[PDB]
Design a protein around this motif. Sequence first.
Motif, short mmCIF file in Angstrom:
data_model
loop_
_atom_site.label_atom_id
_atom_site.label_comp_id
_atom_site.label_asym_id
_atom_site.label_seq_id
_atom_site.Cartn_x
_atom_site.Cartn_y
_atom_site.Cartn_z
N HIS A 3 -9.93 -0.66 0.18
CA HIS A 3 -8.75 -0.50 -0.70
C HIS A 3 -8.78 0.91 -1.31
O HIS A 3 -9.84 1.32 -1.77
N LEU A 4 -7.63 1.59 -1.40
CA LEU A 4 -7.53 2.80 -2.26
C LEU A 4 -7.46 2.38 -3.74
O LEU A 4 -6.41 1.84 -4.15
N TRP A 77 -1.73 6.61 4.62
CA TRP A 77 -3.18 6.62 4.94
C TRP A 77 -3.53 5.39 5.77
O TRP A 77 -2.94 4.32 5.59
CL LIG Z 1 -5.02 -0.63 -0.94
#
Ligand SMILES: [Cl-]
Length: 95
Positions: A3-4, A77
């Motif tokens: 996860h970002l 991304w």
């Molecule tokens: Cl994410």
Amino acid sequence: HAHLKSATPAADSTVAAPADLRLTFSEGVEATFTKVSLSKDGTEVAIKGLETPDADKKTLVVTPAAPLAAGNYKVVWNAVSVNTHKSNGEYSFKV
Ligand SMILES: [Cl-]
Ligand SMILES: [Cl-]
Ligand SMILES: [Cu+2]
């Protein structure tokens, strides 16, 4: 899966020319397999470099070719984790 957690420029925040983008994930990511697309009002901006400096590999440094012109930026991304799992998303910001 990665996860970002945080960016910088931070999602929807406004800043001056940051020099590069930092992407901080919940897990290690692979610079070589990870894709980041930076675009300004819907045309590619040139990325010169991707690197994970630290050894956990949790921060991705995304270096653009130029310092960034003021305006509206979309990041797309596609992360590949150190355990080879694929995640994706997006976010915006402004210079
Ligand atoms: Cl994410
Ligand atoms: Cl790559
Ligand atoms: Cu997972």
